């Protein structure tokens with residue numbers, strides 16, 4: 001098999017050149033292999049302070065936060081609280097606009113509502129304005145025909161999905177996903193006492209961190225360390241090991257195939273491609289020109305339950321952070337790459353593929 005010594009060389013020889021080429025200050029990596037996570041840390045979390053990256057350093061996950069959103073939703077579905085086939089309106093009777101008529105919770109969850117934009121406008125600062133926004137939105141496409149990557153879409157699915165529980169989103173997440181999985185250093189809002197662990201992001205020489213915004217916890221506001229993230233990946237890769245019945249089901253639902261777009265399949269948060277898949281196919285869908293383009297979908301009805309022979313992944317970025325996670329259930333291997341610099345997505349998947357290919 002692969003030796004620990006060999007794995008360390010593979011990780012160092014892949015990660016060290018990447019950091020130098022992409023000028024990334026710090027990086028924390030976890031490689032899941034043979035039932036155990038292996039940690040590798042590099043560089044700095046804060047240049048000014050000269051603080052090294054450690055397995056406790058907190059990185060902004062950006063869109064990888066959507067995997068937590070998906071699982072939390074799947075768990076609510078498994079509890080009988082929500083259904084993906086339900087009209088959005090069942091959860092928001094105030095959304096009276098007739099354009100929402102045939103739009104389901106599935107569409108919000110999978111960016112398939114019909115043209116919801118990338119971001120919730122900055123002018124949207126509260127509930128009543130959020131209503132104004134969706135109420136005046138005019139869909140470019142009919143529901144279930146076009147996938148357009150949007151925080152305005154999945155962010156609303158997140159808010160609405162926790163409504164029947166009676167709990168605010170943050171408490172629903174902590175109570176039903178984070179605490180049971182022992183993700184004690186995973187935060188939507190980082191306490192004052194945990195702040196010294198929070199790395200600084202770096203853009204083009206400026207120290208940066210994520211700013212607030214409507215539906216941020218649902219779409220891009222989660223921060224964690226590489227330990228919690230490795231254990232999160234391990235729960236999603238092997239949910240047979242998750243004791244909570246509905247949480248086990250929610251994990252499955254988030255890795256289920258709802259739509260096919262080219263060579264990939266849309267889940268709830270997670271995205272998948274059939275394994276074996278070559279690097280060039282994964283890398284080519286990594287591009288922003290592609291990731292952000294509106295594309296037609298082929299519906300999978302009924303949705304297909306998780307398939308073990310899959311490359312499941314998700315990229316995430318904020319102004320100062322660049323993260324990526326990928327695992328193959330069939331092979332029980334996975335990788336987590338957290339970084340305090342948003343470097344090119346294709347570079348992320350290339351390195352992840354190369355090291356996983358070594359296993």
Ligand SMILES: *C(=O)/C(=C/C)[C@@H]1NC(C(=O)O)=C2[C@@H](OC)CCC[C@@H]21
Nearest residue numbers: 062063064151220288291315316317
């Ligand atoms: C998820 O990480 C995410 C939310 C939409 C990040 N948004 C942005 C952005 O700058 O608007 C990026 C881009 O990386 C350039 C494009 C894909 C999504 C991500």
